[PDB]
Design a protein around this ligand. Sequence first.
Ligand code: FES
Ligand code: K
Ligand code: K
Ligand code: MG
Ligand code: MG
Ligand code: MG
Ligand code: MG
Ligand code: ZN
Lengths: 53, 197, 54, 126, 294, 74, 170, 108
Amino acid sequence: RKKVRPRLIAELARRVRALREQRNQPRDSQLYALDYETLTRPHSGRRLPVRAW
Amino acid sequence: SSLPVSPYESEPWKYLDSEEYHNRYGSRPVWADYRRNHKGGVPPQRTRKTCIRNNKVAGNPCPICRDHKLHVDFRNVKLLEQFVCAHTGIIFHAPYTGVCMKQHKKLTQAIQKARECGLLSYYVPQVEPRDADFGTVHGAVSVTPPAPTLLSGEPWYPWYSWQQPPERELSRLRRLYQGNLLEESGPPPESMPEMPT
Amino acid sequence: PYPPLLRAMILAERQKNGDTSVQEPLLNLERTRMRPWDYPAKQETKGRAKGTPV
Amino acid sequence: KAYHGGHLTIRLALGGCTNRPFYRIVAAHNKCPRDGRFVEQLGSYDPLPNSHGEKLVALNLDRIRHWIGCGAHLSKPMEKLLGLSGFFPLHPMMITNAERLRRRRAREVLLASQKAESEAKETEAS
Amino acid sequence: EVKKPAFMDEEVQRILTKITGLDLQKTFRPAIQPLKPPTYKLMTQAQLEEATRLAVEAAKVRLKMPPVLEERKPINDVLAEDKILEGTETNKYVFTDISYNIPHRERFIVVREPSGTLRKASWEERDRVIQIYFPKEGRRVLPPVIFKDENLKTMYSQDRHADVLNLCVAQFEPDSAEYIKVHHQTYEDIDRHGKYELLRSTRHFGGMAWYFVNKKKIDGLLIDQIQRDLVDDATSLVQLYHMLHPDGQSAQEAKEQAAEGVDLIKVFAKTEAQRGAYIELALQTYQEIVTSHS
Amino acid sequence: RKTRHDPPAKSKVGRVQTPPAVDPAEFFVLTERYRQYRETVRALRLEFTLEVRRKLHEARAGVLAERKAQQAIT
Amino acid sequence: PMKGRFPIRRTLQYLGRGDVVFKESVKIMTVNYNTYGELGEGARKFVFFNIPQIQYKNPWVQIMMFKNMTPSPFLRFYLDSGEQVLVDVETKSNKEIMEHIKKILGKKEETLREEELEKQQRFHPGNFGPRKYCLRECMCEVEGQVPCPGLVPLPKEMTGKYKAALKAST
Amino acid sequence: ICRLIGIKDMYARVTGSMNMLNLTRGLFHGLARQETHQHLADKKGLHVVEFREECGPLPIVVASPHGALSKEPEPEPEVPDTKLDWQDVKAMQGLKRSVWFNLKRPAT
RNA sequence: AAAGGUUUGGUCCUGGCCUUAUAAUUAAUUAGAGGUAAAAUUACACAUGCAAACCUCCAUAGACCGGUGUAAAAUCCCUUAAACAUU
Ligand code: FES
Ligand SMILES: [K+]
Ligand SMILES: [K+]
Ligand SMILES: [Mg+2]
Ligand SMILES: [Mg+2]
Ligand SMILES: [Mg+2]
Ligand SMILES: [Mg+2]
Ligand SMILES: [Zn+2]
């Protein structure tokens, strides 16, 4: 073989993306915040099930 | 629209013993003196689909179709034998005898039906019995001791039957699912109710 | 008890192997008893939601 | 395909033609296609009654016991087949569904009797 | 109690093999099948005799008799009766264990009926499904139609009894009622028309002689063996009749007179022969021809 | 089937869950059947797990396995 | 005419006549033989006739042949344990050489039959699937079962087209 | 020609030139110089035995030496030196045949 | 291939091309219905709709199924080791 060549951009992308995750980890106050008028989580827009209202 | 009517329709085997057959065919097969008309030296691998369409006959009728008195019936064994190899017992393919595909399929069914009823002989290989041991004392083919629940008449497992829930537990569910409830169901019928008809 | 077919296969093997007995095969449920469905689960091994806003 | 995650499962693979279904009982990684790559064939199921009026199930009970012992899950249709055979206990919903059918035929019979009684009133009116 | 002789008893197999006979031309008659070009070897008289010896060894294995068994007993065992499933199914389910390394007579084949009963499969059901999943060359899933009484009579007119029996061995099990019915019908037709020669030098002769001895109708086979100058075989048949019926008047008469050879056949004629008058006439004629010519 | 990066439909934004209604007598009977059924099936799955491992050890280090190994060397 | 001398050596039937299947220990078989002489004639025939058959049944064994390196012909087998089995084939017929090596380092008939049976353990006659792997593709082929709709049309009541129409009518 | 001779079952292949005269001369040259079984028994003094697969291991004696039967077995080599035709062997080696081979043809 | 046609004044040799068999697609002309299988110009550009949810909040899933043949002689079979976003 030997025509398979390195992928520097792919390696750089994987590492670089990892750094952003570690620094920009969200917090419990943000992930689990809720809008009680609509019963929907603002961070992700997830609407709670009906049996939990 | 008037195809000829054979006198031997009821008893087809009679024709092959009549003098008319002997004069026309002698002791050779009925397909011996037939040649197919085709371009080239190698013929097509299938014969014509059929020689008779809506009471009309094709240009070069095949051995069966050209002679109307010849009848392909499982009982007419003498005719059927001409289409089976005497040495190998394999039915000849349609190109071999020049019969049309319709009659070849019809002949194959008659040959197989004659063999199934024993009118037409074929070679039966000798095969050993299926099982080396012929004992019938294993539980699979014998009597298994009846289970305790089976003798008493009870279900195999207790939860197979309907067990009325405790009254407190039914109320616990009425609180949990308050506002979205269905009419409470009692014990189901003991047997399957006979289907109304 | 064992299921009806699986019980018959056990009794058949006994007779084939020469073991003569009328004991009823029994399943033991103590080793594999299930927790309630609402039992608290292991939070340490649970996933956490990602930090990409929708 | 090169799957990542998943478990072995025993399920029914649909075969046959249109209006003529036939199933192959197989052990396969759950992420594989229904009729695609499988690990072992453990039997077959013909859901159409034959000339003798019998639906024919074939179970390789030695290999089935082997794969359940190695973590193989079971699909719900296969649990119903193992329950009818007697190799497994009857599935909870097999029992519940049979009870629902009994309660639903009980109503129909009662309605027919009421209709006959209503028809009897029509007979009384003449 | 003196054990009743069996079909596979070394003594019975010896007598049945002898009366059956061997004929390398009949045992190895050409099969009507796809043919291949023959091969040729140059052999001395020593090599040729060695080849004939191997042919006789193979003819012995080819003439191995098929088992003679008593009719199986119907399977009627109910594993369970789950009435909750009554009315939830319209057709019976048949479940077959198809594990490869289980003998077929030790496999579990159960039926879940619409009523909910889980029962063991009958003998007819067991053979049918075992053909569907372990297909045997020669056997068909559904019983063939050649075994109908009218179809069997056609085969008998053509003197195709060895085929009727070879077909009955490929299709049916030895202990099945269909197997016994067909065999007992073929053996009976051979008797009525004196066609004993059809099954000689075949694996089916032993069962035929066995059936006649047990049914006390060896008269025809003795008369035919004597008329063919096979009088050593006829005596062995009377020994087999004196072995399976020890308390019979004929067997007790031979002990009193210590009869041997042709004497045994003469004793049978007077005591237990259904048609003794003919056995003596045929036996006498054989002796006259043998003595007169030689 | 859609990928996680695909945009959601605009005809199903209004969608809200409609939980099934519960029959108290049948829900409880069914909950118990599932608990007892799954315990029986867990007892059978364990027995099958042991037959697999017993057979494996017999093949690996059974009586017959050991004799053949030494028989070959001799 | 097939080229070369004894062209039968280049037929699959001849190559399959070999009976020497080496044990798993055998890894290499070096052949030292002489091209000229009278006591090495059997060795020369063994290289000519038998070495092809041995390699055919033992594809993973390295057979390397050396010519005119020693006064006498011999065979030396190298086993996986590190043992070296020297065999002396001088004044020995090619048939004698084959039988000798079969005895000392050849698998027995019993062992080979067990492997053949084990190889086919996962083929089941009941299994349905493609012709390459299975006898029957579908249960429609079995006698007594419902036939394939393509070959034989199904009854109207067993068809989804018909059942759907009734549900609309109801 | 085979019909005129009376041969009913045979296979033949012709290659090289298709000259009709050379084929007729070549055919009669080969058919008229063949060795019957009775001749082979006399030349070697041994029995000629036939083994058909449809008759099993049954040995069939087709020709016996006219004079004195020998007692020295014919030498049977371990590996014969026969000269083989690639066309004949090619089929048995598993090589795919031509689309024109063994086609369905009318009875000859 | 069981072969055939075709160089010449003629015969023979050599040697190509073509024919006869089988199939797929498109096209011309032609045709009733029914069962079945298959569906295929283009990795060109795309209006519109739909194709992933579930669920007492957490999680899990949307990494599959489905699609195409872009790239690369890229692969097959085999050995060893370790894992899994698993059971
Ligand atoms: S191939 Fe079996 S139903 Fe069509
Ligand atoms: K040419
Ligand atoms: K067109
Ligand atoms: Mg939860
Ligand atoms: Mg078109
Ligand atoms: Mg896919
Ligand atoms: Mg490309
Ligand atoms: Zn015709």
